[PDB]
Design an enzyme around this catalytic site. Sequence first.
Site, PDB file in Angstrom:
ATOM      1  CB  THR A  22     -58.390  97.800 -51.010  1.00  0.00           C
ATOM      2  OG1 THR A  22     -59.369  97.061 -51.749  1.00  0.00           O
ATOM      3  CG2 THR A  22     -58.714  99.280 -51.036  1.00  0.00           C
ATOM      4  CB  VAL A  23     -53.309 100.359 -51.841  1.00  0.00           C
ATOM      5  CG1 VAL A  23     -52.149 101.073 -51.136  1.00  0.00           C
ATOM      6  CG2 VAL A  23     -52.927  98.982 -52.340  1.00  0.00           C
TER       7      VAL A  23
ATOM      8  NE  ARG B  52     -37.122  89.265 -59.171  1.00  0.00           N
ATOM      9  CZ  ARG B  52     -36.923  88.778 -57.937  1.00  0.00           C
ATOM     10  NH1 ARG B  52     -37.471  89.351 -56.870  1.00  0.00           N
ATOM     11  NH2 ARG B  52     -36.079  87.774 -57.776  1.00  0.00           N
TER      12      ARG B  52
ATOM     13  N   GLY C 223     -55.628 102.453 -54.903  1.00  0.00           N
ATOM     14  CA  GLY C 223     -55.811 101.366 -55.851  1.00  0.00           C
ATOM     15  C   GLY C 223     -56.526 100.137 -55.273  1.00  0.00           C
ATOM     16  CD  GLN C 224     -61.178  96.962 -54.648  1.00  0.00           C
ATOM     17  OE1 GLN C 224     -61.778  98.036 -54.673  1.00  0.00           O
ATOM     18  NE2 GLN C 224     -61.744  95.871 -54.157  1.00  0.00           N
ATOM     19  N   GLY C 225     -57.050  95.646 -56.399  1.00  0.00           N
ATOM     20  CA  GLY C 225     -56.917  94.495 -57.289  1.00  0.00           C
ATOM     21  C   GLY C 225     -57.052  93.172 -56.532  1.00  0.00           C
ATOM     22  CB  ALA C 226     -56.245  89.659 -57.470  1.00  0.00           C
ATOM     23  CB  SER C 227     -52.534  92.344 -54.765  1.00  0.00           C
ATOM     24  OG  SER C 227     -52.840  93.632 -55.312  1.00  0.00           O
TER      25      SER C 227
END
Lengths: 351, 351
Positions: free
Chosen positions: B98-99, B203, B92-96
């Site tokens: 890349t994984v 959570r 995955g990839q986002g603002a947080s």
Amino acid sequence: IHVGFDAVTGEFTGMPEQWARLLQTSNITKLEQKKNPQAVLDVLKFYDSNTVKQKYLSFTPKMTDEEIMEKLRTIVSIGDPKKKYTRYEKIGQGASGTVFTATDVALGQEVAIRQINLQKQPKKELIINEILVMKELKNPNIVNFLDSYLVGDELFVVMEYLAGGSLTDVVTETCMDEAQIAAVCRECLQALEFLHANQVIHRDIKSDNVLLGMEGSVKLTDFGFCAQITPEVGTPYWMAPEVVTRKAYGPKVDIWSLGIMAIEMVEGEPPYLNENPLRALYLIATNGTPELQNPEKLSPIFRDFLNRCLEMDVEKRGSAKELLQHPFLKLAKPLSSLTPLIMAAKEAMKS
Amino acid sequence: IHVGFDAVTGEFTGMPEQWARLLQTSNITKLEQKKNPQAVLDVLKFYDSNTVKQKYLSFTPKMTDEEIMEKLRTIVSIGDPKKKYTRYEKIGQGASGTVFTATDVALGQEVAIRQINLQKQPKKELIINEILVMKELKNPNIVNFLDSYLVGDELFVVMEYLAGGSLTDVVTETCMDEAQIAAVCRECLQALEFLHANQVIHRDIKSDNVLLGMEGSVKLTDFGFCAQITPEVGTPYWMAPEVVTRKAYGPKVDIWSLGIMAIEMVEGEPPYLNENPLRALYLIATNGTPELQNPEKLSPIFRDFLNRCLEMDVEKRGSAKELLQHPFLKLAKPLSSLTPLIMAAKEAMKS
């Protein structure tokens, strides 16, 4: 172990088979041997043992990852060197790492990048201390440390560079006047004064290690490990007699090398070009200066300058702080006068 | 600001145009609205404002490059992550960041790699402190921090992973017996006991965030920033009533989510699958538990377990340390019994 010399036959007695091998391959004649056996024996010892070696400025005023990260604290920037610099060109590679030239995308100014693998070298502490020293050792006539970056196990060290190429490229493709030569000599002496004032001996002053800017600015390279940013067996034409006689030596060896460099600038090629390296070393030890191709053209005051640089007596030979006052450097042109020669050189180089 | 409710017409008075918009799109009926207006109003407030957000474990017992290098001292290894790991796949990839998943070339064991740009995030200090915390927060039923590497401006954080995929892949392609379900529940409760003992609320307990080993070992993920190593709008089926009523909440929300997860394990799909998210939230707030498809099959002791997990009263609802003693977990099979279901799942997945 002691070796001898039977003066009428011209044969050394009791010397190692290495030195005897070299002597056969040396093209030193039995006349030249009996003329000065000690000089021959000194240069055999030198060539048999000069693996060149490395140089590290450990002049700071088994290792673990926390120790490495601690030493790197003051010197590593957070940034991508593959994004901050473009126009990468690989200029060399060896055990000492890989070297590139590149240009800073923001400033538009050229740089050199050494890329060191920290896992594959055991001397990690020396390399980092070399960088720590070089960060504080700042002068306009040397290439300075700019920045560093950590990329996994690779440390990238960024040094200044200059777009105008080496003084060899100018000296081989153009003819310098004495006012140009004195300007180069002044800037090299400004560098040597500073290095000698910080207990650094350069050891390798030659036109290959003199870098020119397009505006004519001049910097030295190859004074340290980080400053070896030059493509570089062969003949050591720049070396002083006390070095090749395997004797003790001090900073005035750089003044000799500067003298030989001044010869190279006016003759267009270095001395001993086609000579056997062993015979070249013999000649350096016995004769000192090589012999000039057309010595009658050169001014009296340049010849006085060359004499103060190439005096074989270390005590008589000039120091950097003294030769900076020598009347030859009064003749120096503005450094911009090198610009047309730098461009002429580049347009000849192509390739 | 205060809003009202005209009981015979069934119209809220004075509510924001956002909440009125949502209400029209909610498929909550005017019967359901007058049945409990407060629940409706609470879930409108929740959905209007739940941008999800991030989570950082700042539980540690403007920034400059020297500050960064200092904080990284204890956590960065010197090594090449593109050489220590192979079989990279971008998950995955986002603002947080890349994984990736990858496997350690030396150990032969799978890992997850988060790749964070330290220049492009302003919350640099939070990320590093998150790593410093996670290095010390160690437990076998969570994915642990393994290692970290600096690559210019990119920080690579390596977390444990497991080859057997997610509990969702097992639950969707196979049928678990209660002795398998109790084994999963035991390992998740062992994780929740430890996290709650360190002031962490997960959570997001759900089958997507439960990771299985090929030998049947079980770990939680998505408890922190570094542990978000999962591909992840939609309906929040795992959420407890006090959360969606926008009320104060504490660690027993994870026990509710574990209960819903136990339902998902025996029913093969999560609740509210085709429901409007706003209606699903309304139902969670008013009804609590969703309704089972075939409740007559389930043992008394599993039903007691589900009741202690899905009690709407927070005080009556079990804690992790209590439910670990619940007689359902006596039925647990060996974790190896999951192995054939994990393989069945993988051979169905293909794709």
